[PDB]
Structures are given as C-alpha cells and as structure tokens.
Amino acid sequence: LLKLFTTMELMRWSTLVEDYGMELRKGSLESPATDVFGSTEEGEKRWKDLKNRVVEHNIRIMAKYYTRITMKRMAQLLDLSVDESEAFLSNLVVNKTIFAKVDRLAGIINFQRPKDPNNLLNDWSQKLNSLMSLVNKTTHLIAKEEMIHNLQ
Amino acid sequence: KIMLNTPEDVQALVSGKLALRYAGRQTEALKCVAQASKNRSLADFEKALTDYRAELRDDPIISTHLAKLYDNLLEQNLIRVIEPFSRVQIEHISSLIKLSKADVERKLSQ
Amino acid sequence: AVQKVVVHPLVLLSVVDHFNRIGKVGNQKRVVGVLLGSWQKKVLDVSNSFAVPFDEDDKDDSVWFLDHDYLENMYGMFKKVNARERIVGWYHTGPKLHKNDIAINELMKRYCPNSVLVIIDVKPKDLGLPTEAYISVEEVHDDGTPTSKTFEHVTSEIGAEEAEEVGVEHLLRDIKDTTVGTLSQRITNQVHGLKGLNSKLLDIRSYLEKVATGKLPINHQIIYQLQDVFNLLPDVSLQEFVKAFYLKTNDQMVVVYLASLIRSVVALHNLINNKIANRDAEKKEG
Amino acid sequence: FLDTVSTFTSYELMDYKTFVTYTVYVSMIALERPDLREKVIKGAEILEVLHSLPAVRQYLFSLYECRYSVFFQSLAVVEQEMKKDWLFAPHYRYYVREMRIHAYSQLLESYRSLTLGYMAEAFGVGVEFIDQELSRFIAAGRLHCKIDKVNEIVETNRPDSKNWQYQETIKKGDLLLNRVQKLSRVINM
C-alpha cells in the first residue's frame, strides 16, 4: 500500500511475484486468495488488468515529472516488447494522452515542450519567478534588518 | 435510421417476425452496414461494398449518403489515431487499417 | 492568522502631534501610543488612536512606564462615544527595536489580545514605507533556541475610506492623482531605480558588515534562502525569450502604427484649417 | 451571375446555355474551393445544367477532386474552345496561366514537401517540364517561398502566416510613408 500510495519508484514486479505466491500460500490472514482466483477467467482479468493498471499508473506518476525518461530505454529496463507498449499507448489515447509529443524518426516521446505561447506560459512563469523574488526578497530583508536590532 | 448511427434498432427491426417475412438479399447488405457501424470497422464496410456491389450496383442516389457515412467513419478513425500522434510513420499508423495511403492521403489533404 | 493590515494616516498625523506637543524639552524618546483598530474582521483597520505618558531610563533599558487607569478611562470614554472600535495594540516612534519591547508589549499581551507592533521613524527622511506591521507571536525555531516573542513582518497599506482622502487632497493641493499617461509613468520609471537603490544599497552594506563582524546568532538559516532566491535567476541566456522579444516588439510595432496613423488623422484639421483659415482671412481682411 | 435563378433564354444577346458556358470559366477559375462549395456546389443551378454537357461535370469534379491525369488529357478541349470566340478569345492567355498557378497553389497549399515521383505520376508529365514550370513560378509566379533541389524533392516552408501576416501592412506603411511625405510637400505651398 505504501508503494502504491505515491511516488512509485520504477521497480521489478518479480519481487511481487513471490509476495503474491505466499499471499496464496499462507492461511493466517487474507486467506480467500484462492477465492479471488476462484473463476478461471475473472482472476486472470484481475491479474493482467492489475499489472496493467500499475504499469499505467506509474506512467501517470512519471508523466508529471518532465525528466524525459526515454521510454525506449524504459522498455529495455522493463524487459518487455514494444508492441504491448504501443497497446499501452492505445490505453493512453483513452487515458487522455492528448498532451504529448511523439517522433517519426526516433521513438522518444515528450510529455512537455508545447508551442509555448510567450503571452501565457512564459508570462506566468516570469510572473511567479520575478514577483516571488520581489516579495520573498522583501520579507527576509527587512525581517533580518529587524533581527539585527537586538544585538545593540 | 442507420444514418443517425443506431444499429440496435436495426437489429430490433430485423429480429421482429413482422418484417422478417419480407427479408432477402436486399436487407443483408444493410445488416453488414449496421454490423460495420456497431463494430466501428472500415475494411469490413469495404467488404460490404465489395461483395454486395453486384445489390449495391442498382443502389439509388443515396449512394452518396452511404459514401458520406464511409467517409464519416473514416473521419472518426483519422481524428482518433492521428490526434494523439504529432509526428508518426504513415505505415505505422496505416497498418492498423491495412489500407493504402492513396485514398487516405487524398481525403486527408482534401 | 492576519494576512494584511490597513493603517489610516490619522494615527501617523497623531504622531505628527506627538512631535508637536513635545514642548521643546530635549527628550524626544520613543513615545508609546495606544493603537486602536478593528480586530473583529480578519483584516486590521486602524481608525484612530491616542497616547499614554511613557518614559524610560537613560542607562537601564528595562525601565518602562505605562498606565492602566488612563488606558481604561480613555478607552472607556472612547468606547462610550464610539463602541465600534476597541483596543488592538500599540506602537512606538523609535527607529530601533529595543529589548524592553517584549516587556512593554507583554502587558498588552496579558491584558489585551495579541497586539501588533509598528516601527516608524522620527524623521520622515526614509523613502520607504514608514509603517511595518509586526505581529507578536511565538514561533518554534529549528536550531533549538527557547521559544521567545518573534516579530514577523506583516504587509501594510495606507488607505483612507471616505473623508481623509478629500481632506488630504484639499490640504495638499500639490500632489497629483493617478493620471495615467506620460508624466505619472515616466516619473516612476525615472526615480524607481533610486527607490530600489537606496533600499538595497542601504541594506547590503550593514548586511555585509554583519556577515564578517557578526555574532549573537542573527538567524543565519534565513540567509541560505536569501542567497538561494538570489541565485534563482542565474543570468538566463535569453535564448528562449527571443520569441517573447518578438512578441513585445510586435506590440511595439502595433503602437508604432497606431501612433503614426492616428496622428496622421489628427493632422487633418490642422493641415486644412491652416490653409482655409489663413487664405480666407487674408483675402477677406482688406 | 448569382441571379441565374431568374435568368431565361434571351435570344437578344446570349442563350442561357451560352451564359452558363461563359460563366463556368469565371466561376471555375475565379473562385476557390470554399467559394465553389458555398456558391455553386451548394446551389442546384449547376446541378440542373450539368446534365446538358457531360464535359463540364468532368471539369468540375476533376478539378475539385484534384485529378490532373484526366484534367490534362481533357484540357485540350478547354484550350481549343477557349479561343475562336468573340469576347473570350483575347483573354485565353490569362485563364490558362491563372488556372495552372491556381491548381499549383491548390495542391501545394496542403503539401509542404513533394517528391518528383508522386508529382510526376499525379500530373502525368515529365519532370523536365515542371522543372522550368516551378522555376518560372518562383520569381514570375510568386506563389510560395524559395524552392530547393539538394535532394531532388520539392520542399517549401511558407512562413506566410506568423510574421508575414503582420508584414502584409508594411507595403501600406511605405506607400503611406511616401504619401505623408507628399503631405509634407503640401506644406507652405
């Protein structure tokens, strides 16, 4: 639950394979795991759509960061084929991936670098940066100027 | 009624015993059109325009409307797969529809 | 708790009265006045105030003289004539924050609610805003120092509601209103560099002095955020902002076309009347 | 010619079929695709009078369909019919060039880069002729930006929107500058 809470670090599910296996083996708690796998197809849909759900959720988490994870290398670190990653993109087109940038020559994707209208985006960033430097520069300047008065 | 994109009532009209006695080779092509509409397929609609063109050859002027439905589903597919792809291969995106780039390029550029 | 305060110029002109009723005695110390306001709403609004005889000692700083009967009588009569305003805090005219201000403010912390502190200058030579709202709240320090009274700067604005604007505007007859256009803009664009130059230049000298010649911890922790924010603009290469200069310069071109075209429209009546009036007045003069 | 609904066979000046045959040139050439789709394609008049001659339907659906392989094979009838007319002959040079540059701007509008294979197969003509065609239409035609042949591929940029959309007024700024110099010439005399 803590790994699924937030800031999901890219980890291998093989460590979770034995966790789920012993989750089916031990009967002290969470016993009805065989009842979760009761149906021949329902448990398979919950498992495939479960690993799919976390392999999409971690993409939704790393999509906030603009670090350019270079999903071409990520497909190599995840040890999976690029075809089911294109199917994952087929899940992203319904997952509202409209804010993205792809490349015809290479395979690197970009979740940022829009047309960047200078009257809205650079306007906003320059407003928060310049104004934040102005008022933040204003607070501790005279605040420290009042802190040095106690030395007399 | 198929121009307004409702194949369920088409199934309701071909499942009733009243209009079932007047069925024939004419309504089969309409069942393939409604099947391609509920399946959201394009090459299957071209198969309906290929095998049944010998009852689609005597089709009335509404053939232009049927071509408007074909080009409408084509427009939905184009705004479906191209919209998330800023820059992508023409064969990587045309391989899904397994159609040539001639008609697709002409309709797009048009 | 409180984000901003509103201080009317009536209390500062009452400090002008503090400097008027001295009587030429030779003391001119930090006369403490009882600040009044409206603590009901989240924003603080000072309407008026009064004073109390306050005298300190020459050598010992811990000497402070206040009065409870005068405060309850002036506040009682003032509440009898106007019950919409109550006690909030106090203020001193001294430019330096002395150590005894924790004991002076502590009395109005016990008897009165949380009092705000305002430091002003005895001589109106400071170009900056004379009013600084300092809230009297205790804050936890990360270094482990014991909890003590801390004066955090609260932003302040000098505004008048209905009448003081009219009275000030009539008594001055020299100040100008907003008057958007050439003069009110270009004056700010000329003297603004001195408005920041006297502040920064006046601050970083004693700052750099207290860097090497400083002890008695001055909260060096905030200096890391100081130089951090100062290093948050590491001389951008302006590469991405070129198109923004094309946008602002394109708006400049729009102002060029508006000025040239509109002034060219204004030249009509002048460059027509100059001829039709002169030649007709000349041909009809005699 | 928008009032063609009320027009009728006028044996005095020109027959109705001759009026349509004469307005199909100014309408077919002097109008773009939105103008045709709004005026004539939406109107039922050309839908009524297209059944008289099957050629006009070919010159309208082939031009609107951007099929040059049949439009150039059938364009000889427009060339021969364009001349040998009372009032329509001396202008035969303008309709040809204007229609060719209009079609080249039509195809070149939605196309940024163009290889010589798809172009030669689309137009059905040798590359040696389109070479001097576009070579003469860069300076003479003045339709788009400079063309390059470093890869033997028609590749244009057309930065005519962002900066040139604002630069469309600099001509009136310079002519207006000389006109206010004339305004300075009116001074004192």
Side-chain angles (χ1 to χ4, degrees):
Chain A
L1 180 63
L2 192 143
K3 290 185 287 185
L4 296 170
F5 187 76
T6 191
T7 66
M8 188 183 295
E9 186 69 27
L10 184 62
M11 66 183 291
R12 178 65 67 192
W13 297 271
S14 296
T15 62
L16 277 76
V17 171
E18 69 258 8
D19 290 332
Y20 193 71
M22 69 181 72
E23 192 270 330
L24 268 71
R25 287 181 177 91
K26 68 180 181 291
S28 179
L29 52 94
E30 60 193 357
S31 295
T34 62
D35 290 331
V36 173
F37 276 171
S39 296
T40 182
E41 295 293 327
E42 183 68 28
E44 293 179 353
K45 292 296 290 183
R46 295 175 187 175
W47 183 253
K48 179 70 175 177
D49 191 75
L50 192 144
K51 295 294 183 182
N52 194 2
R53 188 174 179 87
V54 296
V55 85
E56 293 172 358
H57 183 69
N58 60 5
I59 298 298
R60 296 297 297 162
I61 293 172
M62 70 181 72
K64 181 175 72 68
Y65 295 101
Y66 304 155
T67 188
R68 292 293 186 267
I69 201 167
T70 64
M71 72 171 288
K72 293 295 289 183
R73 185 69 60 84
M74 181 183 70
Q76 184 178 2
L77 269 71
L78 289 174
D79 293 331
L80 50 86
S81 179
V82 298
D83 292 331
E84 60 186 359
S85 294
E86 296 175 355
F88 290 162
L89 194 145
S90 296
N91 297 115
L92 260 67
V93 67
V94 298
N95 203 1
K96 275 78 176 175
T97 190
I98 62 171
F99 186 74
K101 179 72 174 66
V102 295
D103 290 330
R104 183 188 177 97
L105 193 145
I108 305 299
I109 53 97
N110 298 320
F111 287 163
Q112 201 56 38
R113 191 82 264 277
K115 301 177 180 67
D116 284 331
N118 292 314
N119 54 4
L120 296 175
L121 193 142
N122 287 318
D123 192 1
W124 183 69
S125 296
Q126 192 67 41
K127 279 291 295 299
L128 270 70
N129 193 1
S130 296
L131 270 71
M132 184 177 177
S133 179
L134 287 170
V135 296
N136 196 358
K137 180 179 71 68
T138 308
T139 55
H140 55 72
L141 184 61
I142 58 174
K144 182 181 182 293
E145 195 271 332
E146 290 294 329
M147 291 296 173
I148 64 170
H149 287 170
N150 297 115
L151 277 75
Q152 297 294 321
Chain B
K1 199 182 67 57
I2 207 63
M3 289 177 71
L4 55 96
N5 292 319
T6 301
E8 183 67 28
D9 292 331
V10 169
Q11 186 177 2
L13 287 178
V14 304
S15 178
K17 191 175 71 68
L18 182 62
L20 186 62
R21 65 188 296 270
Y22 284 161
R25 298 291 296 165
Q26 295 296 110
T27 188
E28 292 180 354
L30 294 173
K31 288 176 71 68
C32 293
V33 170
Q35 184 66 41
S37 70
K38 68 184 289 184
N39 201 4
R40 292 182 293 172
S41 179
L42 199 68
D44 292 331
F45 191 76
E46 281 290 328
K47 185 177 180 180
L49 293 174
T50 301
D51 197 3
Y52 290 98
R53 71 176 66 188
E55 291 84 5
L56 292 173
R57 186 175 177 86
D58 203 1
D59 188 74
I61 311 100
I62 53 97
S63 296
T64 304
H65 294 89
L66 293 174
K68 185 69 176 177
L69 193 144
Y70 171 77
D71 291 331
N72 194 1
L73 294 175
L74 179 62
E75 281 179 353
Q76 294 298 109
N77 195 2
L78 290 167
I79 70 170
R80 182 179 63 85
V81 294
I82 281 94
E83 194 271 331
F85 281 162
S86 65
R87 192 182 68 189
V88 78
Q89 298 88 15
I90 60 170
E91 62 184 1
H92 177 73
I93 199 165
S94 70
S95 66
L96 193 144
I97 205 64
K98 63 184 181 293
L99 289 176
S100 179
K101 275 79 70 177
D103 55 355
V104 177
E105 183 178 1
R106 288 173 63 250
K107 292 296 290 184
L108 280 170
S109 66
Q110 185 176 2
Chain C
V2 176
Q3 184 177 2
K4 64 182 181 293
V5 303
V6 176
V7 176
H8 286 85
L10 181 59
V11 62
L12 292 176
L13 194 137
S14 179
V15 179
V16 177
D17 187 74
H18 284 81
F19 297 158
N20 194 1
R21 67 181 185 272
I22 294 172
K24 300 285 103 176
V25 295
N27 206 5
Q28 61 266 12
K29 285 195 290 187
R30 47 187 62 247
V31 177
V32 169
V34 178
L35 184 64
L36 300 170
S38 178
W39 190 254
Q40 183 178 2
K41 199 181 286 185
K42 187 183 286 185
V43 64
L44 194 146
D45 187 75
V46 170
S47 296
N48 197 2
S49 293
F50 62 93
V52 58
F54 179 78
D55 288 328
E56 290 180 353
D57 195 1
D58 194 1
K59 291 183 180 180
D60 191 75
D61 199 4
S62 296
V63 173
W64 55 272
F65 293 155
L66 292 176
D67 193 352
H68 294 282
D69 197 1
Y70 191 79
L71 193 144
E72 292 292 327
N73 287 319
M74 285 291 105
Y75 174 70
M77 296 176 183
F78 184 77
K79 186 176 174 66
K80 183 174 73 175
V81 66
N82 192 359
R84 294 178 180 90
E85 189 177 5
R86 72 265 189 98
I87 41 93
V88 50
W90 61 276
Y91 63 94
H92 63 86
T93 188
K96 298 292 184 182
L97 186 69
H98 283 88
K99 187 177 179 180
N100 202 5
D101 289 329
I102 187 169
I104 301 166
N105 199 1
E106 189 68 28
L107 188 143
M108 291 185 185
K109 188 175 181 180
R110 297 189 305 272
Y111 290 97
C112 301
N114 46 1
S115 296
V116 66
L117 197 144
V118 173
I119 290 174
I120 59 173
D121 195 0
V122 291
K123 269 75 176 175
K125 294 180 176 67
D126 194 1
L127 192 143
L129 208 152
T131 300
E132 286 87 0
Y134 294 157
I135 187 167
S136 176
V137 291
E138 292 180 353
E139 293 179 353
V140 175
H141 200 273
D142 199 3
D143 202 5
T145 61
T147 302
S148 179
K149 188 180 287 185
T150 303
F151 290 160
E152 185 178 1
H153 175 73
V154 178
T155 181
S156 179
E157 62 182 1
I158 303 299
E161 192 264 326
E162 182 68 27
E164 195 170 5
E165 287 179 354
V166 180
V168 164
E169 185 179 1
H170 180 74
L171 287 170
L172 283 173
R173 283 287 183 265
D174 197 3
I175 198 169
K176 199 177 287 188
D177 292 331
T178 304
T179 65
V180 184
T182 170
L183 53 98
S184 296
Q185 195 172 5
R186 75 175 182 260
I187 289 169
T188 59
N189 300 132
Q190 281 179 357
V191 198
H192 80 89
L194 194 144
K195 290 183 172 67
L197 182 62
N198 58 4
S199 178
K200 181 180 178 181
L201 184 63
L202 194 142
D203 289 329
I204 66 171
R205 291 292 181 267
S206 179
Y207 173 75
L208 264 65
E209 182 68 27
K210 299 304 289 183
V211 166
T213 66
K215 59 178 70 66
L216 271 73
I218 55 176
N219 194 1
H220 185 78
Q221 179 64 43
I222 203 66
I223 293 173
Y224 299 103
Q225 186 175 1
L226 180 142
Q227 190 180 1
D228 198 359
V229 176
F230 284 170
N231 285 117
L232 283 179
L233 187 62
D235 290 331
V236 180
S237 296
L238 267 295
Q239 297 293 321
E240 184 67 28
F241 207 76
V242 173
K243 186 67 172 65
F245 280 161
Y246 171 74
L247 192 144
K248 183 66 166 61
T249 311
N250 195 1
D251 291 330
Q252 173 61 255
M253 180 66 76
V254 174
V255 181
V256 170
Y257 289 163
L258 288 174
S260 66
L261 268 64
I262 289 299
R263 288 291 292 165
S264 296
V265 175
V266 178
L268 187 143
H269 295 88
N270 289 318
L271 296 179
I272 286 172
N273 290 319
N274 63 358
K275 295 294 187 291
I276 60 99
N278 287 319
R279 74 179 178 88
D280 286 334
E282 195 273 332
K283 76 185 289 184
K284 295 296 289 183
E285 183 179 1
Chain D
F1 64 92
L2 191 64
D3 60 351
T4 183
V5 178
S6 66
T7 57
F8 193 70
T9 298
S10 178
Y11 61 93
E12 297 181 354
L13 294 176
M14 286 178 183
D15 194 359
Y16 179 75
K17 63 182 181 181
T18 64
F19 181 75
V20 176
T21 309
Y22 287 165
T23 195
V24 76
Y25 290 101
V26 63
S27 68
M28 183 173 68
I29 285 93
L31 275 72
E32 59 184 1
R33 294 191 69 187
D35 290 332
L36 294 174
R37 185 178 182 271
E38 182 67 27
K39 289 185 181 179
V40 295
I41 296 173
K42 187 182 286 185
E45 300 87 5
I46 197 68
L47 297 171
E48 287 182 351
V49 304
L50 63 83
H51 294 88
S52 179
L53 294 174
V56 178
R57 187 178 65 246
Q58 293 179 356
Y59 295 115
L60 290 175
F61 286 166
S62 69
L63 182 64
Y64 186 77
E65 199 176 1
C66 194
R67 287 185 181 272
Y68 294 98
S69 296
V70 67
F71 175 74
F72 287 165
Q73 183 66 41
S74 65
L75 190 57
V77 180
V78 180
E79 177 65 28
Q80 294 179 356
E81 189 178 1
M82 187 177 288
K83 64 182 180 180
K84 297 185 291 294
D85 198 357
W86 178 257
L87 195 62
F88 197 73
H91 295 285
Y92 79 104
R93 292 296 299 271
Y94 180 72
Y95 288 98
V96 172
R97 186 194 69 189
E98 184 68 28
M99 197 175 188
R100 293 294 295 272
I101 192 170
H102 183 74
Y104 291 162
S105 66
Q106 179 180 0
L107 186 140
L108 194 61
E109 181 68 28
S110 176
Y111 288 157
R112 190 182 68 250
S113 179
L114 285 167
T115 186
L116 295 175
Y118 183 75
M119 184 179 288
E121 291 292 327
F123 290 100
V125 77
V127 185
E128 69 272 15
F129 199 77
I130 62 172
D131 192 1
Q132 63 182 357
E133 275 185 349
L134 294 174
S135 178
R136 290 167 297 178
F137 277 110
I138 287 298
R142 193 178 180 270
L143 40 90
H144 285 87
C145 66
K146 181 65 186 295
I147 189 168
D148 198 358
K149 202 189 280 185
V150 289
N151 294 114
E152 292 180 353
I153 292 169
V154 170
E155 182 180 1
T156 190
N157 195 1
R158 198 254 186 188
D160 290 332
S161 296
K162 298 293 187 291
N163 197 1
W164 183 257
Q165 189 175 1
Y166 287 95
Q167 288 177 358
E168 286 180 353
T169 62
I170 198 166
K171 293 182 183 293
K172 301 293 183 182
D174 289 330
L175 197 146
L176 192 143
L177 192 144
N178 198 1
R179 194 173 296 277
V180 300
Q181 284 181 355
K182 171 67 171 65
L183 183 64
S184 179
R185 182 174 289 271
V186 188
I187 304 300
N188 290 318
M189 187 178 290

